[PDB]
Design a protein around this nucleic acid. Structure first.
Ligand SMILES: Nc1ncnc2c1ncn2[C@@H]1O[C@H](COP(=O)(O)OP(=O)(O)O)[C@@H](O)[C@H]1O
Ligand SMILES: Nc1ncnc2c1ncn2[C@@H]1O[C@H](COP(=O)(O)OP(=O)(O)O)[C@@H](O)[C@H]1O
Ligand SMILES: Nc1ncnc2c1ncn2[C@@H]1O[C@H](COP(=O)(O)OP(=O)(O)O)[C@@H](O)[C@H]1O
Ligand SMILES: Nc1ncnc2c1ncn2[C@@H]1O[C@H](COP(=O)(O)OP(=O)(O)O)[C@@H](O)[C@H]1O
Ligand SMILES: [Mg+2]
Ligand SMILES: [Mg+2]
Ligand SMILES: [Mg+2]
Ligand SMILES: [Mg+2]
Lengths: 183, 183, 183, 183, 183, 183
DNA sequence: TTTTTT
């Protein structure tokens, strides 16, 4: 356990302690996470996270493309209508699926901002090291959060990387331009 | 417990650990489960979950067909009226009984899909992997939800794999999908 | 403990362990309940919970008969009006007392079915295993729930086993479902 | 520990253990609680709880009589306008202070009844074991509740054991039977 | 921790246990809370609370004399317009600031009585043991509540131990208390 | 160990405890947190909070000026149009944006006073320690309320420190404050 | 954490 802290407080936690020291992590699993969170070494983030937004009527393979995006080993699916990010003890595809506006708008913005973040799970907090958020929906992206219920709708628009609509029941087409309020 | 951790590392199932070495699994059960979560060898889902829907007036014998279907030992009779799936911890009949829509719409769509999902318990989250869901009702699925308060109701009918009915005081005659609505 | 776990895995009931060696159940009590949940030997229900309904104006001795139906060591008196089956860790008799309709309709339909059920306790889940639900009321089962606001009022009546009624200020006489809407 | 388990399982609730071997109750406290709840010997109430109402205009030394009815070690003064019984853990005499009608009717009946009951606390449940409910009030029991919203007001008066009143005299005089409805 | 228990059962305050024993409170911090809560001996109010109503038009240092009452540290400041006494943790001075009547009339009649009470906090209840309730206001105690809405009605104007007005922009003159209804 | 408490009682911060002695912070972390939360008095406030009102015609670069008052990383941007200061931890710029009269009058008068206050989130309370409140509005502070509904009625302007205005497309001019009702 | 709380 003396060596356990030494390995823990280098980088890349807790995945590498659990890989390297399996026995000592069966015990103290709450405490290693608390020590790491207390110190300023939770592997923070400085990269603008990519946001891909998909729109199309159901049955048009919205989520199929999200599944076929990166390796399934390194993919997380946000369970909807639930503000708990349990299961994020790996990382870095995050596919919030089948959206209808069920997240607090400010937090949704915070996930799409550039600053570091720490989401909360059942039994502590976990750093949010995302690189591509595939926000998959079925409706127009504007309607998710009403303009009266939001201080500024354009703030959400600013951090979108790319957007995809659906064509006349044949093709997935990429939306390019200012058909709606652009960024 | 080093043997127990190694025999968890490759098998990746707490059920096996509890079968082999109960004593260690009794003393440190949060630790083993969290180690399994962090090491990434969890059990995601990549298969379509069949949704057999039974409809009939009460007393006709809907639920006895669910209670005899797969095995008395591998069916999880879902606790009703609430979003808690406690005690589930693996496997693969999930029988939501006596349903009339008392589950959130988006979550009911998400239970009946091919892509992964973590489901919520009193203490944390247990991954969802169901090879077949049996839904028992008194109304037809056309009126489980408000057809106006739901954006696109075709996205539920598209997931049901078989809609079994009750005919005029004779038997449970399986209906054929795609006739009255999609299936 | 090494023997206590052995008893637990094959008795299938934490009550047994709690009575044999309490001292090794005072410690490691979460562990045993989680081994029992994982191993699958947690006890389900597959029998029919025969439901007795008692009616009569107040003070006529409804509750006394309910306390004289089984040993007080086993009768679990349901807490009123608040849908929390706390204090239940089993055994046969359940006396929901002084009933007037303070339970959701589907829960009253589903307690009395023959198939497994899990009830909520205050921060957990308890499996339901009763063999007799003595409902005690001042009103006939008609006046528990309004007919219009109920999918089918005949569903509850099918599950009532016996109906004892107080008449003519002498003594309560068992009914046979003739005058009442029969079962 | 087996001494603590002796004093617990043989007879009583956690209070007796707390009074006998505190150093064995600062440790193992959650597990003694679960052993008690699973053993089944958690003290029910099988007796009749006397109900002494006190009526008098504000300032007549109403509550002085209640605080002098029994030793302050065994008086639980219920907080007002709540359904919560927090902190109770068994306190023989229960003085509902200045009670103008802020408790549900059937719940007030069940407190004054003579058969088991488990009252609710913030995040748990506690078995009711009172023996003398002193209902200090301002009006006669005929003004606590209205006959419109009540099945039958006699159903409460049947349980008021004694009834002290204040009239135009410095003494408090008991009520011999009922000039109003009989108790 | 033998000394810690004997010190806790006498002083009845966890803060004292921590200060007189840091090391053995870092471990067994939950157990000491449960031992205190179950054993009894919790410090309950058995004295009279000394109400000091401070009244005058705004800007005259109503709050200045409120915080002047020693100490600046041991003075709970009641949250405005609210029900929950959150975080109170045991003080001796309670300064309800800038009152209008927001606390229910009966709750204010009960805060100033001479008997134990249990206030509500968001997640539990905390015993209320206060020796002076500085009710800063802007009106006299006559017009805090409507003349007819109060049913008692002379039960607040009994317990007002002190009173201070503010005269014509000169100084805070202690009201003699005789002109109004007596205190 | 023992020296952890020695280094905690002379720091007042857990961060240094983790830095110098992490090995005994991986264990016992819950108890150091409770010890700090129970031995150190909650942080009150005694400092007049500056209230810089920003007013102008809509869209005049008000929000950028608001963020430019101090560091955005320690700036709140209170969720508008409700009464839940979702913690935010104490963050000592407070920018209430687009205020147009929706907080209660006395609550706003209290938020800008020299004496402690505790705003409430959902499921708890957070101490309110703000060195600056930035009320960004649309129209004059006298139109936020009418003098009929507000029986103070000029008590807010004492609390306003300064005023920032936008003249006819020149700049965000800082108000004299000497023409209108004084500051 | 869930419960409570909203
Ligand atoms: N192995 C497979 N075989 C056949 N079809 C597949 C397979 N995997 C994915 N699909 C198709 O992917 C589509 C996913 O679309 P959909 O279920 O509408 O997404 P969502 O429900 O998230 O909007 C389905 O129409 C399904 O037919
Ligand atoms: N002991 C028995 N004897 C005869 N029939 C029975 C018995 N137990 C159950 N049944 C039948 O089994 C069927 C299924 O029971 P149940 O699942 O409670 O009804 P439902 O199908 O309406 O949910 C009912 O139609 C009932 O008549
Ligand atoms: N041990 C006993 N000895 C004598 N009489 C008893 C005993 N237990 C109960 N009783 C009688 O039984 C009756 C039960 O009353 P109660 O439970 O209020 O009826 P209900 O709950 O049906 O209205 C009481 O009136 C009481 O006189
Ligand atoms: N410990 C005590 N010492 C002195 N007097 C007391 C004590 N306890 C109660 N009293 C007296 O009892 C009376 C109780 O009055 P109060 O509680 O206001 O009315 P009620 O009891 O009708 O609510 C007071 O006038 C007080 O003088
Ligand atoms: Mg979808
Ligand atoms: Mg059924
Ligand atoms: Mg009864
Ligand atoms: Mg009183």
């Amino acid at each position: 356990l003396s060596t356990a802290v030494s390995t823990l407080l280098e980088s890349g936690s807790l995945v590498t302690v659990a890989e390297q020291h399996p026995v000592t992590f069966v015990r103290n699993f709450r405490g290693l996470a608390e020590l790491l969170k207390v110190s300023g070494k939770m592997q923070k983030r400085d990269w603008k996270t990519n946001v891909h937004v998909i729109v199309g009527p159901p049955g048009c393979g919205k989520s199929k493309w999200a599944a076929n995006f990166a390796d399934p080993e390194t993919t997380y699916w946000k369970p909807p209508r639930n503000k708990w990010w349990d299961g994020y003890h790996g990382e870095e595809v995050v596919v919030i699926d089948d959206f209808y506006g069920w997240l607090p708008w400010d937090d949704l913005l915070r996930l799409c901002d550039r600053y570091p973040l720490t989401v909360e799970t059942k039994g502590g907090t976990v750093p949010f090291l995302a690189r591509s958020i595939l926000i998959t929906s079925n409706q127009t992206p504007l309607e998710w959060y009403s303009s009266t219920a939001v201080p500024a709708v354009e703030a959400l628009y600013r951090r979108i990387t790319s957007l995809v609509f659906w064509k006349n029941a044949t093709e997935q087409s990429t939306e390019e331009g200012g058909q709606f309020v652009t960024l």
